Structures are given as C-alpha cells and as structure tokens.
Amino acid sequence: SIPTFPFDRPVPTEPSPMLSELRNSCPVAPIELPSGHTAWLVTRFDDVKGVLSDKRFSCRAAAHPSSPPFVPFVQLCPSLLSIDGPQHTAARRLLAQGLNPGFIARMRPVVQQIVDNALDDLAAAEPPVDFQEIVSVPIGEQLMAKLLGVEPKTVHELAAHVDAAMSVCEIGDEEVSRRWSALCTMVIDILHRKLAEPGDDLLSTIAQANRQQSTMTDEQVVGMLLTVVIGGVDTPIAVITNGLASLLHHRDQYERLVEDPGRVARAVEEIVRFNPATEIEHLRVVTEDVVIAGTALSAGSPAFTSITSANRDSDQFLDPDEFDVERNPNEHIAFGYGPHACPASAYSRMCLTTFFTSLTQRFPQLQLARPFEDLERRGKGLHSVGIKELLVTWPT
Numbered sequence: 001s002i003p004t005f006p007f008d009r010p011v012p013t014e015p016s017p018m019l020s021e022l023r024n025s026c027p028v029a030p031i032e033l034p035s036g037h038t039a040w041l042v043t044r045f046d047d048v049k050g051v052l053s054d055k056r057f058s059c060r061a062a063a064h065p066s067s068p069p070f071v072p073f074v075q076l077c078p079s080l081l082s083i084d085g086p087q088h089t090a091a092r093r094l095l096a097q098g099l100n101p102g103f104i105a106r107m108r109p110v111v112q113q114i115v116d117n118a119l120d121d122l123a124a125a126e127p128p129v130d131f132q133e134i135v136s137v138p139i140g141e142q143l144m145a146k147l148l149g150v151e152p153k154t155v156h157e158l159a160a161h162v163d164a165a166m167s168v169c170e171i172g173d174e175e176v177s178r179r180w181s182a183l184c185t186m187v188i189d190i191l192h193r194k195l196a197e198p199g200d201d202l203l204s205t206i207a208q209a210n211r212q213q214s215t216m217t218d219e220q221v222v223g224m225l226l227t228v229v230i231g232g233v234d235t236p237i238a239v240i241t242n243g244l245a246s247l248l249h250h251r252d253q254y255e256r257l258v259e260d261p262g263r264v265a266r267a268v269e270e271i272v273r274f275n276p277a278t279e280i281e282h283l284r285v286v287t288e289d290v291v292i293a294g295t296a297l298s299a300g301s302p303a304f305t306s307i308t309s310a311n312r313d314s315d316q317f318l319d320p321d322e323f324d325v326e327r328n329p330n331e332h333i334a335f336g337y338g339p340h341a342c343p344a345s346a347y348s349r350m351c352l353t354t355f356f357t358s359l360t361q362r363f364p365q366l367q368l369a370r371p372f373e374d375l376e377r378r379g380k381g382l383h384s385v386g387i388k389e390l391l392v393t394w395p396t
C-alpha cells in the first residue's frame with residue numbers, strides 16, 4: 001500500500017528514509033495524509049522547482065475548506081500560504097518594503113547583541129546544558145520580538161500557540177481551535193497597538209505603509225503577520241539547533257568554521273541545505289488536469305513538494321548525503337522556490353552567519369554532551385522536524 005505521512009525518522013536530524021525511497025522509484029508518489037485523504041508527493045530537484053513555480057498548483061485552493069487539512073493555520077486565515085495571484089503579490093510587495101536593504105543593515109548590530117547575550121548565558125552555565133533551551137530558543141524569540149516591536153516575553157506566549165497552528169496530527173482537535181483563537185487575539189492586539197503608536201520595528205513600517213496605501217484589509221494584514229510569526233520563530237530555531245547537531249556530530253565540520261570564520265557564510269548555505277525545518281512543504285491543490293514527470297494529476301488533487309528531498313538529490317549535488325560546509329557551488333532551494341519562496345532569506349542568512357561565527361569563535365571545543373543516537377524529535381505530528389533538546393558541553 002501507499003506510505004502514510006508523517007514519515008518515520010530513525011535519525012531525527014536527518015530526512016526520513018521514505019524520501020530517498022520515493023525519489024529513486026516514483027517522482028510523483030501517492031501518500032496517505034493523517035486525515036485519510038491521498039496526496040501526491042514530488043521529491044526530485046527539477047520536479048520540485050517546476051511544481052513550486054507552476055501556478056496550477058495553488059495555495060489558495062489548498063486553503064479552501066473542502067480541501068483536505070494539513071496545517072490548521074492555512075485554512076483558518078488569509079495567510080501568505082493561503083493565497084495566490086495579484087493578492088499574494090501585493091502582500092509580498094508590502095512585506096518586501098519592510099524587509100528592505102536598509103532594514104537588514106540596521107538589524108546586523110541588533111542580531112549581534114542578541115547572539116552575544118545568549119552566548120553569555122551559555123558561558124555562565126555549568127555544562128552539560130540544553131543548548132536549545134539556553135541559546136537558540138531565546139535567540140529565535142528575541143529576534144521575532146524585534147521584528148514585532150514587542151517584549152521577548154510576549155513572543156514566548158505567541159510561540160506556545162505556534163505548535164497548534166502547525167500541528168499535522170500532534171495536538172487534539174479541540175485544543176487547536178482554542179490555541180488558535182488565543183494566537184489570533186494576540187496578533188490582532190499587537191497590530192492595533194502598533195497602528196495607534198507605531199515604533200521602530202518591521203511590523204510598524206508595514207502597518208503604516210499599508211494604512212497609507214490602503215491595499216490590504218486588517219484581516220489580510222493579520223493573516224500575513226500570522227504567517228510571519230508561525231514561520232519566523234520555530235524554523236530558525238530548528239535549523240540552528242538541528243544544524244548545530246549535524247556540526248557537532250560531523251565534528252570535523254564544526255572545526256572548519258573554527259579554523260576560518262570567514263567561511264561561515266558558505267557553511268550557512270550547507271547548513272540550510274542539509275537541515276531543513278520540515279519534511280515536506282505546505283499543501284498545494286491542482287486546479288487543472290496536469291502531467292508532471294510522466295504522471296497525470298486530475299484537477300483537485302492535493303500535491304506536496306519536498307525541498308528536504310530535493311536538496312539531497314544526487315542529480316543536483318555530488319555526494320548529497322554528506323555534510324560539507326565547504327561545498328561550492330551549492331545551488332540549493334532551502335529557502336523555497338516560486339512565488340512563495342521565503343521573504344526572509346536575506347535576513348535569515350545574515351542571522352545564521354552572525355550566530356555561527358560567534359558560537360564557533362567563543363566555543364571552539366564545544367561537543368555533544370550525550371551520544372548523537374540519543375536525540376529525539378520534538379513532535380512527530382508537527383510540521384516542524386525540530387528536535388527535543390541538544391545537550392552540549394565544553395571544557396571548564
């Protein structure tokens with residue numbers, strides 16, 4: 001029979017073996033979602049790029065109530081992953097206006113200070129300690145706090161509801177809706193506060209520009225902001241943590257960064273290629289009859305791509321399952337492809353480069369505290385593949 005999603009991960013920080021199995025047997029494979037509906041998964045690099053840039057695979061149709069469920073937030077609000085066409089383009093323009101090059105430059109010292117303080121907390125601790133609880137989670141929460149113009153504690157409360165918003169089959173049906181309502185109320189209240197008293201933050205600049213341009217309704221802005229919050233907290237945390245786990249397991253790769261900090265930028269490209277934050281992408285629904293890689297898909301078929309699998313495709317990368325932070329050229333699609341490609345790719349690259357430069361400079365002899373085989377996935381039923389904890393140690 002056909003395989004069921006979520007797939008197993010005997011190694012939590014590595015892709016599910018099912019991905020390579022399908023990649024080397026069927027380019028468009030049927031899979032059974034937890035809701036029972038059958039969907040088709042695309043796993044090859046060239047094919048994944050084609051689907052993500054093929055407007056016949058629409059996120060809007062995936063947000064339609066009749067469409068099968070995957071992540072609740074997509075069907076509960078006009079998220080950026082719930083729309084297409086001119087409506088989506090207009091929202092991305094506004095977001096791109098806020099994430100302008102001047103904004104990135106101004107954020108460089110802000111990120112450096114957040115990284116410094118988190119690493120100050122690590123150095124002051126007595127090893128072993130959970131790197132995730134002490135460093136990456138505070139960093140991810142405090143970065144989003146700067147984007148939203150709120151206090152770090154406020155983002156911590158928001159993050160509690162993010163798991164429900166991205167729950168494929170982890171959280172109960174009743175608690176999802178109650179945690180979703182709380183998440184919406186928080187974001188709604190934040191937006192209204194910033195509209196009344198805009199500050200020096202990304203959210204305020206977008207809210208002010210939209211108010212002047214009168215191009216998005218308040219509900220559409222909330223939908224976009226919800227997407228930013230859901231995608232901007234857990235994903236950086238998962239990549240940093242899982243990425244570090246790979247760096248400390250393949251310990252010779254961590255040492256390469258210690259040896260030459262000028263190559264950390266290149267290493268970040270390999271980190272995002274090698275440690276994606278999800279197993280498959282958000283749901284798409286085919287709107288017309290199409291033929292993809294010799295496979296016919298009728299209108300209404302639910303479709304999934306796997307950037308995780310694409311970034312391991314031996315047709316695009318030499319020795320794709322090897323972690324090589326010096327890999328160059330490295331033409332991955334870790335930040336997506338097509339209209340829904342990550343709007344924060346430049347911001348995220350700067351953030352990860354700042355962090356891994358500082359970490360490797362201050363903790364050159366960092367090590368895994370316990371065996372690599374003891375790592376566990378935080379939540380199999382979550383869209384994210386972040387691990388439960390990463391215990392590390394260093395000479396004292």
Ligand code: HEB
Pocket residue numbers: 080081092147227228229231232233235236239272277281282307334335336337339340341342343344348
């Ligand atoms: C702040 C905020 C933020 C941040 C930080 C981030 C970070 C990130 N990210 Fe991002 N994203 C986002 C926000 C975000 N994000 C959004 C909102 C989206 C959606 C867009 C659209 O849809 O249009 C995305 C999208 C996206 C995608 C696509 C998906 C699909 O298509 O389905 C991907 C792949 C990614 C990745 C990523 C990474 C890798 C990172 C790091 C590392 N992203």
